[PDB]
Amino acid sequence: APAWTTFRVGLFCGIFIVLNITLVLAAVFKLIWPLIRIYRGGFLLIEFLFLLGINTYGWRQAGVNHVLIFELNPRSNLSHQHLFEIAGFLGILWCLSLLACFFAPISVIPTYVYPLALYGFMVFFLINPTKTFYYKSRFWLLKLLFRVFTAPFHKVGFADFWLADQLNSLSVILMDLEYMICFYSLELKWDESKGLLPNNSEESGICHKYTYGVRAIVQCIPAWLRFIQCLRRYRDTKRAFPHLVNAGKYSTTFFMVTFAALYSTHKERGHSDTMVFFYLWIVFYIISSCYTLIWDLKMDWGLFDKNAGENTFLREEIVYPQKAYYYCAIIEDVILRFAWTIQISITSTPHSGDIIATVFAPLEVFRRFVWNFFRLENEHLNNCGEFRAV
Template structure:
């Protein structure tokens, strides 16, 4: 048993280490706050100058004494540019205001943290030295006493109100006001009600059409109908799983709003995505039941799929400002950028959506089949047109590679990513990772080509079909290994050599797990924390195993189609594997965005980088190359350890550090200031 002097010396030594740690953290907080405040002041001055220049140019281009024109069709080119600049300035000020609110939250969060930990110190050690230290050090610290951030917020509000919104403060604050940051806000009661209602209807209707199908169609050829409706189900499944993704990102603090560069003041929550998926799911089930009971309701079976998919298309392109108008047109704009990838700079959301299309390739192929089937194979005079195939054509036209279009459709998603990688190489002049990534997607072209040649030559009884089969196996293996390694190492950032206790993963992981455990602090006292949140590596190991299995699931399809004589074996396996591939992409999304979020934290990036006069691609590439040089502004080529303890994450600061690869900042292109 230690004597009283030994215990006192131990406590004194512990307190000395404790307050040294507090001083070190206080210094880092003060330094970071000062840097961000200086950056905000510089940014505010720049925005003021840009606003003044735009307003001066607007006044010079407007003849005195003339009534202001509201139409844009008769504006000159100069006037259009001025209007465009004002629109960009509104967006830039709204993002700048968001950064000020985040910095103000940083002040409050750190002061609260010091107050609570020092209060806990005094309670445990039965002393008041923690409170005294807070008064002497924290309450006079620059990060707490400085009121310049509040002044900047007030000046920004006044400037936007008077100069950009014509004195309308209510309109200005609607543009600037930031929703509470952190976890998702509670959804409206009616939204939650509709989610439950649609999901309940979907389950009941799905059971109904499954039972009906089993009873009524034992002897019918159901595969035309399955292929026509399969794509719709995959889209509904994708939207529902994306809702789970959104919920998981919010809960774990992964700032997907920043990563996708969407408006933090107006975007879809997971509840909205569940509602859309549930509503479309109910329509999908009703359409199938209408097909099955077409003889009783006197509606032609072949009309039902056209009504369903016609409604889906109209829902997406509906120009009326209702039913998530901003989100729908944000998606349409993104799809347009994917299809026109070579002609503009590629952003994260662009190649993320193209990756999703690679997992939804069956949807595109089923859409091609639907169009072909209705043109060439459907017998409109037959009341069971979707359950009967012409004996003359069978599967030899629409469900085969015989006329080449099907292979082209199958290659389209890979082509989008391939050309995006080439465009990114053109913009950055970096062979790695962009050309190497393009090589990954090019393997899909070989796989599809040899699959088409093998299927066609086997149907025609050619002797060289076996050669194409072996080439298909070789390139499918190469493609699967290539994509698997890229998934785990590049997209997810796993198998990092500095992973520490997270074996085979990376140093920092953000998806937590609640456990009960005991924790001994400083060998002085013991406390039991219930539901302590700890990183849970098992999620990551299961995801790795799942990715390996599903990346090689094609082996099952090839085995069954070549070793069995069942004509529909290929359709059966494809119908099972397509939803599994959508599920694989759902898991992939979690870890891909986690990796991107950690990169943003390492770069201290918490808001979109808005520039009214952005650099063009060549100038930005030249600037980045200069920064990579040994004698440049800073050498960004080598590996660095970025401290993330001051990250302005929307949920909480990340406490550990990791070696990050270089991550270039994104310049926002011309966007509507209220867009999703």
């Protein structure tokens, strides 16, 4: 951690902190869903990166050889410091973009320019053609990212899977992107400066609707990747218990989205005995929520084992020093997996649910944040997933 490196982390954080309060005061004291949706994607991304940085700190302190497990060069290079740094800069940009949108200083530049600008720079940074800005790391990411979407045609590895799972948790952004593209193209008034009140984005909210179920498909995209990948491994090993079963777990997503998806279109059409679908949806969802949970506590974290005479409900050997964290995680995971039950009850209670979706999404990423710790620990201790080492 070069002295200057630490200094940058503080400086970037400092600007970010004084600003994040600015926008809050701005709205309450100084003068809409499209904008909320459009910018929601960015936040999750930055928040995600920051939490991952914390994870890196953790895996180290404990002693997890994150390098060997993720099969990397001995120099990690991207230490927590550097990770907290990258997030800092993106944070500043996002904050500036959102704020600028609130106000309107230029008087010639249209508002719809700012949002795109925000994402444009992000794309470039990663694809920087020049050898600047952690060029060594940004390239690694780009390479593996490809392998992910080409898994049926690429041999599997831990990094190829880990990334896949993280993607599963971060899905709203994908969906958001879709909304952004669709928004402008249809019913967006390229003429009006504000461009935030066309058809009140209500009837024209078709972009977030399910006429083509575009959102439905994009929502399943995260799952498809892992699912096909799992079958690929099964083919690699010819036959397997751990694999096939795992694939099925992801498969439940398909049935769920499908029934729920059909549900909404039928309701719009006057139902014509569409009540039956509303039952299946909930039914399958329960199966989905439960299927994962059991896998998480047993297959993934590796808890509830016979050997631990010393520790109740936990494995024989633990590495995170306070036993309390493990117990807390188990309760938290259950609540997070079954979070939608709260949402469904509150749906009955104008733009309802929209807020519910928003509030739940940061928590979803936090669940993954907690999950990372344990999954890596298990991998280090027992080669728990299908054995890649040796």
